[model samples]
Target: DIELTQSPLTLSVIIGQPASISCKSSQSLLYSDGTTYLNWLLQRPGQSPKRLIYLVSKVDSGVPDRFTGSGSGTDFTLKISRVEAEDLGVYYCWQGTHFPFTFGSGTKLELKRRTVAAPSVFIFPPSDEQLKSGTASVVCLLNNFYPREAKVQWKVDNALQSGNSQESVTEQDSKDSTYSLSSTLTLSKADYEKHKVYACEVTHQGLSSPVTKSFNRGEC
Candidate 1:
């Protein structure tokens, strides 16, 4: 699958400060007409997302000059010269030239709030259908967190693990302005028995201690 990813799942900015979102597509989005089909969009809180920059650099008629899009092929970036209070929301990058158009996960822009919300964490076992493919995966999700800061790590038998990386994902709740993050770890299904326990540790400053969820064969 040609996936597009955006970095800095969450961004905090002052009213007049500048902000930028980095987006990269798995495949080049440059078109035959020498045009890049990448577009940048803005989703105001509790509102719909609208295209602000089209074809890499062209801004929509109603879009303000403060917004700019640049880059070509597989790497693109969106910038807000001066982020306004009204610009605090979610931003995404979309590619259209590709047959199966894909969008960057998303980036939430925050204007700094006084309240902090601890997140609810969940660990999901590998699906039966997916495990059959010889690899077993577990998903650690941190949802409904506020202030945009959290750390997630995977462990095995109370020891830190390596060779397994994570895919960072985010989903924002517009109603309460909370944010969600998910990290996935995968290994061979046959390796499950090699370890007695597997765990995911999550930490948020709002919480008194880190939240940990473990998985064993019973999870299957």
Candidate 2:
């Protein structure tokens, strides 16, 4: 299965501040033809999913003037402009051009009244005000790390040597920090009570600190 995790969707921000959503796939779209198949999508609560992009990065014709997609291979990004109250909803990206289609967790572009989709983006440990729910699976995928050198460490609940973690690291664009890595952790139905608190961290050269993120199985 392809998994996606959007960056934190902040509640309040000054106008003109840039906001971006991230999308990741489980497998490489490296077709024999040397091209990838990925796209962007937007879904507001109580509404249908809109096709924002297709064919591995082409924007759908006549989409809103604000949405844009750019990325090559397995990693991609979708950005929006002038986020409005009506823009409050989840944003996602998927590798529809290939099998095992996947999407980034939906991200509420703006948070207000809850919607009806699984938000892959969040404020902190995820929340369910949106209604759609699923197993508490936490994963971290690191890519395009700079300086061509780094180490990744996974921790759960502030403990050493986090449990049930995996990693996939590879290189594609040396000139542009084009490397990709991914890991996943599954939660139990009964024993795993928290359901909303996993963490992902990355430590590498050319940086001041290890990049860290809080994975919310519950609410953010």
Candidate 3:
């Protein structure tokens, strides 16, 4: 099965600033004829989607020079030279090289002025089903934040831990335009027993200080 994934699910930028979104496919999007059929599109609120670029990196007619597409194989990117208020909409990447064409999970672009809101954070402990394997995932969910972006970090026993962390694209709350994101840290039962504490720290421009939620071994 082919899947297209996009990054930074939600994007908020000041007008005139440059912004970019990425799309990655589970498999190569190249065709046997040496032509790729990947496309970039945009859909404005209350309107239909429009093609911005087609055939991997060619901009469509009437499209501005600011909108560009690049990358190849299984990875692709769309960049906006200068974000305009009118560009606030959903952007998607589509592939036509294979049957049952696929579209990347769309990304939402928003025009933001700095009225920031702090995020609500919570942790999801490993499920009972996962405990049997001696492996667990500590998930942190950040909810209802303004500006549509935030940084998340994980700590073990008060010390910052660095490695691969899985995170979801920032998703907008259509009702209010706020955004939410989730991140996960994979762990082993042995680390849980030894560390005694795990923490998720979130930082956003709206807040003067970072907010953190901690979980103890026994709490999980």
Query: Per-residue lDDT of 1-220 in model 2, one digit per residue for the tens?
Result: 6565556553333334456776665566666776667766667556798877775556788866666677765566777675444445566666665556666666655332121211121112323432234544455666554333455565567654455656655532323323456666555544345443566666655345666777544454
> In candidate 3, which residue ranges exceed 4 Å CA deviation?
1-88, 91-108
Ten-residue stretch with the least lDDT total in model 2 = 113-122
Best by TM-score: 1
- Given candidate 2, what's the lDDT at residue 205? 52
lDDT of 1 by residue, 60-151 (tens): 99878998888876788888999765676788888887678788899988765467889888888788888788998878888888767788
What stretches of model 1 exceed 4 Å from their correct place? 1-109
On the 0 to 100 scale, the lDDT of residue 58 in model 2 is: 67
Using all chains and alpha carbons, the TM-scores for the candidates as numbered come to 0.54, 0.43, 0.53
Q: Rank the candidates by lDDT, best first.
A: 3, 1, 2
Query: Residue 216 lDDT in model 2?
Result: 45
- Model 3 residue 29 CA deviation (Å) reads 27
